[PDB]
Amino acid sequence: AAQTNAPWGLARISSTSPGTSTYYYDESAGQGSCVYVIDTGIEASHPEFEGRAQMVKTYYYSSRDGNGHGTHCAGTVGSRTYGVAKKTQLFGVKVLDDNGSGQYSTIIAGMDFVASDKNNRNCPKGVVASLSLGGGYSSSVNSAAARLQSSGVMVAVAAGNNNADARNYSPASEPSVCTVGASDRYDRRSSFSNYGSVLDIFGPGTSILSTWIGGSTRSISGTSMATPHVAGLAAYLMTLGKTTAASACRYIADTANKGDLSNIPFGTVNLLAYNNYQ
Numbered sequence: 001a002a003q004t005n006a007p008w009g010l011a012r013i014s015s016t017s018p019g020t021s022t023y024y025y026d027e028s029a030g031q032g033s034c035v036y037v038i039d040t041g042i043e044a045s046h047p048e049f050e051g052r053a054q055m056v057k058t059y060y061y062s063s064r065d066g067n068g069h070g071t072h073c074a075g076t077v078g079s080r081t082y083g084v085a086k087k088t089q090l091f092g093v094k095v096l097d098d099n100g101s102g103q104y105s106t107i108i109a110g111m112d113f114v115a116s117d118k119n120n121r122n123c124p125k126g127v128v129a130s131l132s133l134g135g136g137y138s139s140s141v142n143s144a145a146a147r148l149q150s151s152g153v154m155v156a157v158a159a160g161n162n163n164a165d166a167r168n169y170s171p172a173s174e175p176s177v178c179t180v181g182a183s184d185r186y187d188r189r190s191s192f193s194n195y196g197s198v199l200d201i202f203g204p205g206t207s208i209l210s211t212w213i214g215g216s217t218r219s220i221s222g223t224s225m226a227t228p229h230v231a232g233l234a235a236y237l238m239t240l241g242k243t244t245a246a247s248a249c250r251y252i253a254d255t256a257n258k259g260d261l262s263n264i265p266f267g268t269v270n271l272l273a274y275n276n277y278q
């Protein structure tokens with residue numbers, strides 16, 4: 001399948017070179033997989049989700065995405081026009097309030113919820129979780145992310161936006177999950193993206209067009225935008241059967257475009273997520 005005039009990051013994950021604008025992908029499109037977006041919520045009624053989005057848990061007095069951030073991330077995972085995996089199932093877990101903030105206890109609770117919930121959902125091709133959030137280092141946060149991975153979920157996490165080493169942030173610093181840095185349309189690591197040996201992969205994160213609340217769209221930047229590219233790619237590869245949750249990060253790293261990025265500090269991977277279509 002081919003989506004012409006796609007957002008630049010979708011085109012980039014299906015190309016070996018920057019500057020193209022068609023997103024090429026297998027029509028299976030992540031059907032039968034599921035991605036939990038652990039964030040501010042998801043506006044499930046948004047037409048771009050085509051009924052494939054559902055809120056499953058909130059830690060606040062409403063499950064509504066009153067911010068937009070979670071809806072944006074979900075759209076990069078799986079919306080019709082802005083998504084990597086255009087037929088996956090999206091599940092929303094609201095751990096951040098409508099200012100985009102959350103206590104570590106709440107983030108841990110949300111991860112634990114996904115660990116115990118996902119086998120009760122219709123996800124024959126596998127389960128991903130996208131964590132477009134983080135804070136300062138916490139052993140308990142890292143442990144919860146590692147247990148979520150070990151429960152059978154492909155966990156993708158944002159590296160963080162400090163232009164610093166991701167080993168000082170959580171859950172980015174948990175080695176057993178997939179830690180995602182951000183790039184711009186010219187194949188440069190994004191100005192704000194964290195780096196370091198703990199990064200597994202980079203994906204598009206600067207000026208990412210996706211869904212927004214109110215049935216709308218918005219372009220924003222961050223490692224929170226790169227993470228859902230990887231989560232959606234994992235869902236897509238799991239539906240094709242080329243990997244499973246346990247090996248998905250390593251498989252994505254091994255099949256990535258290698259050496260294409262600039263502004264990559266020595267010792268950080270130079271790997272850009274790539275779907276190997278065509």
Ligand SMILES: NCC(=O)NCC(=O)NCC(=O)O
Pocket residue numbers: 069096100101102103104132133134135158222224
């Ligand atoms: N104490 C952790 C926290 O609340 N982090 C805020 C956060 O990650 N918001 C989403 C983002 O900035 O990517």
Ligand SMILES: [Ca+2]
Pocket residue numbers: 016017257260
């Ligand atoms: Ca290249």
Ligand SMILES: [Ca+2]
Pocket residue numbers: 174175176177178179198199200249
């Ligand atoms: Ca890792």
